Ligand binder design. Structure first.
Ligand code: HEM
Length: 291
């Protein structure tokens, strides 16, 4: 498969800045979701899940085709709880009917990170909705109950290296696990809707205990009331992952720079951009526009 980026007809930077503004204004407004965490966290998880289906070997899956819109992908067990991010974005799609689903679902993740005080993420437009029979089969997204060798091998299918995996996993300072969605329960840290390097600091500084939860799964619980998954804990059990965790724990700007590069790569995998295509857009925040 080749998937060529095609700009929605007649749209410029200012049109996309309006879809960003509408998502950011509705984040501000619906601040009560999930005990006042807000929709920022589930929106960056939706953007990583519609992107994480990509297979570098045959170019199937990934964000291009917007296939989460179809029943097979939408009802994937690994996607449980993302229906709330969908429902949030749906009024926005009725208001800007011209934007493709992949461009909307992926820009939601970009808007969420930047409005949570994260780094600026360059974003490119051009994904095109593809038909229901291009929807990927369930089972391409990663299990939580596994080790650093599984993690390295999984992210090789999206050709992410070590540094990109550790930077990307830093998004697990956001939001929380919910028993009914994934069989895991608890927050990651204290500031769960502001983007910081907290994930790395907690993994290196907390006294973690392995315990079973009410779903019979194991997780790593700390005295402070925070939790982490076996796959997160992996990043300090592996010596190559561990020196990068340390690096981000000591330098949040280096972490913001590397997360920005790796998250844009994740969102752009499987997509070919012609060089007549516009440069990646850097969107201004509500606060930068005085709105
Ligand atoms: C091996 C990798 C990963 C695994 C196994 C994994 C697994 C999970 C699980 C089990 C949850 C909790 C879902 C729930 O109950 O609601 C979760 C939440 C989350 N994950 Fe990951 N994750 C991985 C990678 C990533 C990456 C690369 C990103 C983003 C760049 C990400 C972003 C998030 C976010 C923001 C949440 C919080 C969602 C919320 O608060 O509702 N994850 N992840």
């Amino acid at each position: 498969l080749v998937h060529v980026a095609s700009v929605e007809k007649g749209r410029s930077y200012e049109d996309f800045q309006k879809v960003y503004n509408a998502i950011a204004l509705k984040l501000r407004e619906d601040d009560e979701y999930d005990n006042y965490i807000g929709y920022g966290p589930v929106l960056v998880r939706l953007a990583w899940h519609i992107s994480g289906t990509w297979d570098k070997h045959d170019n199937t899956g990934g964000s291009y085709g917007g296939t989460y819109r179809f029943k097979k992908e939408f009802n994937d067990p690994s996607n449980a709880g993302l229906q709330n991010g969908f429902k949030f974005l749906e009024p926005i799609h009725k208001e800007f009917p011209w934007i493709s689903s992949g461009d909307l679902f992926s820009l939601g993740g970009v808007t969420a990170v930047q409005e949570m005080q994260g780094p600026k993420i360059p974003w490119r437009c051009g994904r095109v909705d593809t038909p229901e029979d291009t929807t990927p089969d369930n089972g391409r997204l990663p299990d939580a109950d596994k080790d650093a060798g599984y993690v390295r091998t999984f992210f090789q299918r999206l050709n992410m290296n070590d540094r990109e995996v550790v930077a990307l996993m830093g998004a697990h300072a956001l939001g929380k696990t919910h028993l009914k969605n994934s069989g895991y329960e608890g927050p990651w840290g204290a500031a769960n809707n502001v983007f910081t390097n907290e994930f790395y600091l907690n993994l290196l500084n907390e006294d973690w205990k392995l315990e079973k939860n009410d779903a019979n799964n194991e997780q790593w619980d700390s005295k402070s009331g925070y939790m982490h998954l076996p796959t997160d804990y992996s990043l300090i059990q592996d010596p190559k992952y561990l020196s990068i965790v340390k690096e981000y724990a000591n330098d949040q700007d280096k972490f913001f720079k590397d997360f920005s590069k790796a998250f844009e790569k994740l969102l752009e995998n499987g997509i070919t951009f012609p060089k007549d295509a516009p440069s990646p857009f850097i969107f201004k925040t509500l606060e930068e526009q005085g709105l």
